[PDB]
Amino acid sequence: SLKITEVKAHALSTPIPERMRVESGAGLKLNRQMILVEVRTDEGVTGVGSPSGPYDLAVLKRAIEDVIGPQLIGEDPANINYLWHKVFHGEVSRNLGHRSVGIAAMSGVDIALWDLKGRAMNQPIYQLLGGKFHTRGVRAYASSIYWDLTPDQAADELAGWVEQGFTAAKLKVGRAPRKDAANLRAMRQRVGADVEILVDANQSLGRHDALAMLRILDEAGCYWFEEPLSIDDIEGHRILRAQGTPVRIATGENLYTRNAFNDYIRNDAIDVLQADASRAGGITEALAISASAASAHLAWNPHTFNDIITVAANLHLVAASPHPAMFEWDITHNDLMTRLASYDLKLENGLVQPPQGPGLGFEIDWDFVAAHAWKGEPAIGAGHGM
Amino acid sequence: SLKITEVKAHALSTPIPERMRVESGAGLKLNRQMILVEVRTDEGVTGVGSPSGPYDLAVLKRAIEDVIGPQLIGEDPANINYLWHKVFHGEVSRNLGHRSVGIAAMSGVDIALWDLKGRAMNQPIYQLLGGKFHTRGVRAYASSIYWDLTPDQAADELAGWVEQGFTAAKLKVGRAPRKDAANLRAMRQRVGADVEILVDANQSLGRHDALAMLRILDEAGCYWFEEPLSIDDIEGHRILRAQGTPVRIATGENLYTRNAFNDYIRNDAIDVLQADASRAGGITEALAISASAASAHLAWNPHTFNDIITVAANLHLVAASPHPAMFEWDITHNDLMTRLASYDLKLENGLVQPPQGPGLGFEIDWDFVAAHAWKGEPAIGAGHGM
Ligand SMILES: O=C(O)[C@@H](O)[C@H](O)[C@@H](O)C(=O)O
Ligand SMILES: O=C(O)[C@@H](O)[C@H](O)[C@@H](O)C(=O)O
Ligand SMILES: [Mg+2]
Ligand SMILES: [Mg+2]
CATH class of the missing domain: 3.20.20.120 (Enolase-like C-terminal domain)
Structure with missing residues (x-):
């Protein structure tokens, strides 16, 4: 079996030329951003994921690495079903809210576990x-x-x-x-x-x-x-x-x-x-x-x-x-x-x-990843609905 | 990619000592029977399944081999989702009934495709x-x-x-x-x-x-x-x-x-x-x-x-x-x-x-299989509800 050793969240930001910035009810797009989740194991099989956006990158990173992550360290990544429930019921639902950025964070980690499983099985x-x-x-x-x-x-x-x-x-x-x-x-x-x-x-x-x-x-x-x-x-x-x-x-x-x-x-x-x-x-x-x-x-x-x-x-x-x-x-x-x-x-x-x-x-x-670390740029302007 | 070459249904029967025969609303059990489904491929990866029972073994065998099977021969067994719908909409729903022994027959084949997939992936x-x-x-x-x-x-x-x-x-x-x-x-x-x-x-x-x-x-x-x-x-x-x-x-x-x-x-x-x-x-x-x-x-x-x-x-x-x-x-x-x-x-x-x-x-x-071929024995007595 494998054991999870780390859950990482790489905050990334990419620019949008002013003329290419589009707006909808969700807001005016400023930069295209993401968290790239990396789930790592003791034997070196890795999976990656993304919890989508726009959600604040620092909120996502914290939730992924420090709320969800600790529930995963030392666990066999093969038991995705077990881990989804351990995380949701143990931390995410009550402590981030049942319909929340916490669920998106969980999603990115879940996707990484599936990527990891596929890679392990080739x-x-x-x-x-x-x-x-x-x-x-x-x-x-x-x-x-x-x-x-x-x-x-x-x-x-x-x-x-x-x-x-x-x-x-x-x-x-x-x-x-x-x-x-x-x-x-x-x-x-x-x-x-x-x-x-x-x-x-x-x-x-x-x-x-x-x-x-x-x-x-x-x-x-x-x-x-x-x-x-x-x-x-x-x-x-x-x-x-x-x-x-x-x-x-x-x-x-x-x-x-x-x-x-x-x-x-x-x-x-x-x-x-x-x-x-x-x-x-x-x-x-x-x-x-x-x-x-x-x-x-x-x-x-x-x-x-x-x-x-x-x-x-x-x-x-x-x-x-x-x-x-x-x-x-x-x-x-x-x-x-x-x-x-x-x-x-x-x-x-x-x-x-x-x-x-x-x-x-x-x-x-990973070269692209290394070159586009987030430095605090905003992703999107204020949304509508008022 | 594999291709399916045969869909076989092995009809099996095993006896029950009179002392151990039990009855419920479903009827008095006489013989414990099954169809062992075997799906074979060109490269020799094989899956097995069972459509449960009691259902008449000849009806099951005919349905599996000659109604469902022809939809499978020559197809890639990896596409289980595609094949389920090909079989249901192409033959089984209309031609065997939407809530029928035909569905059980499909189930035995679907299990065999999942067994095959698992064996192919180890x-x-x-x-x-x-x-x-x-x-x-x-x-x-x-x-x-x-x-x-x-x-x-x-x-x-x-x-x-x-x-x-x-x-x-x-x-x-x-x-x-x-x-x-x-x-x-x-x-x-x-x-x-x-x-x-x-x-x-x-x-x-x-x-x-x-x-x-x-x-x-x-x-x-x-x-x-x-x-x-x-x-x-x-x-x-x-x-x-x-x-x-x-x-x-x-x-x-x-x-x-x-x-x-x-x-x-x-x-x-x-x-x-x-x-x-x-x-x-x-x-x-x-x-x-x-x-x-x-x-x-x-x-x-x-x-x-x-x-x-x-x-x-x-x-x-x-x-x-x-x-x-x-x-x-x-x-x-x-x-x-x-x-x-x-x-x-x-x-x-x-x-x-x-x-x-x-x-x-x-x-x-497979020796047990060979030695227990069905010879027309019945599985169960008449059910209740009338
Ligand atoms: O650009 C936008 O309006 C949103 O970010 C999208 O999520 C959009 O609702 C979509 O359906 O892709
Ligand atoms: O023995 C019987 O009553 C039936 O064959 C069974 O299917 C039974 O209803 C069950 O729940 O296993
Ligand atoms: Mg939309
Ligand atoms: Mg029952």
Whole structure:
């Protein structure tokens, strides 16, 4: 057997050229940052992970190394299930909060344990999970077309991603619903019916404005309506879904553990569960959520947006899952997507394939890591919702 | 990458001395039988499985070899998720029925694919599933004390199993409710409060008789009431569960796929889901049911009763699952529990451990297999419920 010797959190920051900084309800992007989790063992098998973002890097590092870490030192890393519960019940739930940055921290560590397990077995994670369902590849969408655009500019950006091979893309909405509607109508007109258009309000609307927007989305044949309302307003999501349109009500990037999603399902409030393996509790928890969605005849299509590790962790799960694919691919300026590891975006007929090596299935460029240590830069401006 | 070259179903029968034949609502046992599934590949990596029983062996063999098999020949066995859906949607659901012996047949093949995957990776299945949760072992129960006994005899048999190390055991009921009650009362007095007593009616009661019995079970502090009613009467189960007693309402050995269990959960009709990996759709399907149970704050404790393969397949999953264990262990006369493979019952403080070899984790005695080919013997007498 192996024993865990260290749990490390490397805080990393990468710059965004001013002209490339985008804003949504979540805030204006400043720097693309991450924690790279490293779980090390006595025999030298190592796994890495990421607890996503934006979350404060010092908070994440402290939680990972000094709250979670001590629960892992000396333990056999093979018992991922045991360790998830030891950590959640022993420290994280009460001492960081049950729906919290602590759960994202746990997620990064869980992903590292799965990477470690795959590497120890010399197998890609998706093979551990019963192999592929999506044998030909996984349909991706370009994320996203952000705020501050004219209708023709928005349509131009969409045409651009479609040219690159994408069969679907997502539009940010919320700040100015009349502009959102104009943008959406121009975009649909430009690409026709063969391209799926997703919309994401980042919790920015109230119920009545969301009902008004849903009518537009329905007219435009939008695939889903993501975070239409505060995640705290479950009944509001039920009301939207009860309209019975072909537009899916989607949420989950800010909901944590299977428990949050159970509450939405129980209240008939959700069509697409978006639990991110790197946020909602780990690969371990995302697996459970995906299964629970299928039991209820609903879909699981994760949020994946932060770095190439959060993308890869989710992609292994998605490739293995029978849910129809609508896989989020961050197309914004992001060095953490392109330079962190040996794995890049390759679309074939609009599909991506998970990395094929052991564990997460690629190698970290530790030179890049050594060159991008965080020195206190902020990741994102203040969010909206006030 | 491997390719599947054959899917074989070995029909086996083993006798039961008349003195050891037991009866429940399911019928009088005559012979302990099974299909040993064998999936072979071009490179010679082989997996085995079992679709449980009692199901007619010819129906099983035909389904496995000639309905399911043709969907598998030539395919990569690593893609278990893909193959499950290829088989279900392509053939089994419509052409064998959605809640059928066809699903059990699929389950035997799915287990064989998981055994194959584990053997190919040189890992026990529980390691693939995220490793152990129950690191110290899995709490087992002695299954079961059957019909036809006096209270004196029932109490004595229970004391015998407790002496062997069991901390829990199950009693068959349903033919004579007043005698059942007397047996239970004698059993509880005999062993005290520290031993869990489960009850199993094998669908043999009507609603009002089950309500009356539940009062008894509550009095005796029983752990669960298994198949109290027809599996077809979901509302009846809701009514029992709505009494709010500490007695769990349990069912699932005769329910198939996650869909059956979702219907029970949606109707507030179940405390313990008993989906058997070898009946309800495979390891693949049981994993999903276990997760769905947890999401709903309910328990998954599988039915495991037929042979050492059905026991082992479930035990890998149970060991890896955070559900409190109440693991079924057939203590009746059954050569398929003792002579088929090199994995015996070993209790330590009432706990069992999964096999530790690759795949299911033990080797088949192929000489025993060869010497016990089915010759048309029946497995079980007519069941009850009419
Ligand atoms: O840019 C943003 O709005 C957020 O950081 C993302 O998480 C976004 O909600 C998404 O769905 O990827
Ligand atoms: O012996 C019997 O009653 C059945 O064959 C079993 O399946 C039983 O219901 C059990 O829970 O193991
Ligand atoms: Mg979003
Ligand atoms: Mg039973």
